[PDB]
């Protein structure tokens, strides 16, 4: 039924928001900064 090219609605915004937190987390900035520091600086 899906066209695989139809424009997304406001409901798909939450689907887009998901898999972003699943990848980064709420404390992603601190962990990324510390890892980069330890690895390079």
Swiss-Prot record:
Subcellular location: Nucleus
Domain of life: Eukaryota
Extra remark: The binding of ribonucleoside triphosphate to the RNA polymerase II transcribing complex probably involves a two-step mechanism. The initial binding seems to occur at the entry (E) site and involves a magnesium ion coordinated by three conserved aspartate residues of the two largest RNA Pol II subunits.
Function description: DNA-dependent RNA polymerase catalyzes the transcription of DNA into RNA using the four ribonucleoside triphosphates as substrates. Second largest component of RNA polymerases II which synthesizes mRNA precursors and many functional non-coding RNAs. Proposed to contribute to the polymerase catalytic activity and forms the polymerase active center together with the largest subunit. Pol II is the central component of the basal RNA polymerase II transcription machinery.
Subunit structure: Component of the RNA polymerase II (Pol II) complex consisting of 12 subunits.
Family, as annotated: Belongs to the RNA polymerase beta chain family.
Protein's UniProt name: DNA-directed RNA polymerase II subunit RPB2
Organism name: Saccharomyces cerevisiae (strain ATCC 204508 / S288c)
Residue numbers of the full-length protein present here: 18 to 58 of 1224
